[PDB]
Amino acid sequence: FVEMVDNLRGKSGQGYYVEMTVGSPPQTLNILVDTGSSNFAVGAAPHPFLHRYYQRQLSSTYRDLRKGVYVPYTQGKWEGELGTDLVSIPHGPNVTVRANIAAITESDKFFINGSNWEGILGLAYAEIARPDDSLEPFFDSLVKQTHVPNLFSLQLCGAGFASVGGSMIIGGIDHSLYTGSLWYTPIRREWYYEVIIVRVEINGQDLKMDCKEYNYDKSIVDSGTTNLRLPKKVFEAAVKSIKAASSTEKFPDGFWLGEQLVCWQAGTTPWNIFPVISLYLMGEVTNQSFRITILPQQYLRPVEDVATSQDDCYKFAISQSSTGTVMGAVIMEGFYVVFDRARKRIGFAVSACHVHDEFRTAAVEGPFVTLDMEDCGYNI
Numbered sequence: 001f002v003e004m005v006d007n008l009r010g011k012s013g014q015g016y017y018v019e020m021t022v023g024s025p026p027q028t029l030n031i032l033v034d035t036g037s038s039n040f041a042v043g044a045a046p047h048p049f050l051h052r053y054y055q056r057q058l059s060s061t062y063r064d065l066r067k068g069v070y071v072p073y074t075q076g077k078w079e080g081e082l083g084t085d086l087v088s089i090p091h092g093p094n095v096t097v098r099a100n101i102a103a104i105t106e107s108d109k110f111f112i113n114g115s116n117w118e119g120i121l122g123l124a125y126a127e128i129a130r131p132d133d134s135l136e137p138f139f140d141s142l143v144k145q146t147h148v149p150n151l152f153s154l155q156l157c158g159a160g161f162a163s164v165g166g167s168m169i170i171g172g173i174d175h176s177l178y179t180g181s182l183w184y185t186p187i188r189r190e191w192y193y194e195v196i197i198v199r200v201e202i203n204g205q206d207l208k209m210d211c212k213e214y215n216y217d218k219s220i221v222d223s224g225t226t227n228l229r230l231p232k233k234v235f236e237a238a239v240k241s242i243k244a245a246s247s248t249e250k251f252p253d254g255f256w257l258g259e260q261l262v263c264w265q266a267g268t269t270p271w272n273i274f275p276v277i278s279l280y281l282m283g284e285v286t287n288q289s290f291r292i293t294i295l296p297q298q299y300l301r302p303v304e305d306v307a308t309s310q311d312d313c314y315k316f317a318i319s320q321s322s323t324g325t326v327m328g329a330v331i332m333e334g335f336y337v338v339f340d341r342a343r344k345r346i347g348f349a350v351s352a353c354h355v356h357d358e359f360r361t362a363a364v365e366g367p368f369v370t371l372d373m374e375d376c377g378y379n380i
């Protein structure tokens with residue numbers, strides 16, 4: 001799948017996007033890859049933040065669905081007009097499909113000032129599509145209309161001390177993007193890419209919580225979120241343990257809450273005082289799990305645009321949640337992640353591009369024996 005390697009671009013903290021074309025003749029747009037939503041939604045009006053936008057009046061293949069949609073989020077929102085058009089991915093499979101497109105005509109706190117993307121490719125399932133599950137997501141249309149296999153994989157390559165990159169392999173797996181073996185965890189339910197965490201360790205020390213807390217009220221894999229978000233109670237325990245592990249240096253309380261940065265002299269970040277973080281995931285077999293481990297290089301994120309400082313500044317990118325665990329870019333930048341929809345499972349392997357040092361690397365290890373893993377899932 002050499003044609004698709006390195007087909008993702010982005011800037012630190014602004015997301016990973018793929019080039020797409022919409023309409024006839026084709027209009028090229030940069031589109032954020034989002035496993036945490038299920039709409040294909042593109043700027044269609046001259047918002048000043050946008051490099052370009054979808055001009056339906058130029059497309060002979062545009063079809064109006066004569067239906068609008070209003071999509072509010074916890075902060076910000078977008079509103080759009082639904083239709084269909086022909087869509088292709090230049091550095092993807094050599095096909096064209098007719099897909100739903102939400103033409104965004106009003107938004108707030110949605111587009112990012114300074115970013116180079118103009119829309120979002122929601123790769124999750126129809127149950128969470130807006131306005132309802134009758135709006136077929138893009139990937140469903142792709143698979144239905146072509147012979148592309150029903151899976152995709154993501155290698156998100158992060159940065160350290162602004163340009164990120166990676167690969168979205170559509171319809172398969174490229175073995176050059178990972179080392180070791182893939183380990184799979186079941187997709188618990190096809191809405192978000194929902195998974196079940198069965199154990200959490202900080203530098204190998206179990207947090208010893210009731211594992212339902214780790215998945216209250218869900219745990220998901222989301223390329224459209226930067227942080228590792230943890231349920232409030234889990235975040236409290238995790239930070240207590242990370243604070244203790246890292247206690248040879250003291251930091252203001254506000255740093256751990258994401259309320260302020262911490263800066264060090266260039267090149268002197270003390271990586272070794274910060275612990276590794278391990279999530280054990282439900283395995284494929286009864287009573288079997290595996291673990292994924294990330295480094296501070298993943299969860300301490302460089303902040304480049306700090307005019308008021310001259311040093312190397314970082315943001316703590318593990319944060320508390322009210323929506324469950326969110327394995328965002330902090331997790332995904334450590335791994336090659338296989339969204340094996342056909343077999344309702346997600347594979348993890350150590351990413352051949354993840355950021356590490358000479359002493360520690362990200363890891364995917366198993367098998368481990370874990371009992372009562374079904375009890376870890378939350379039910380209303």
Ligand SMILES: C[C@]1(c2cc(/C=C(\F)c3ccc(C#N)cn3)ccc2F)N=C(N)S[C@@]2(C(=O)N3CCOCC3)C[C@H]21
Binds near residue numbers: 032034035037074225
């Ligand atoms: C559509 C939405 C969304 C995402 C985004 C994503 C980004 F801006 C972004 C930025 C940096 C990085 C990195 N590294 C990655 N992504 C930018 C805008 C944006 F809207 N998608 C999400 N995954 S989070 C989101 C949300 O709250 N939900 C809950 C309801 O179900 C769908 C997702 C805000 C939603």
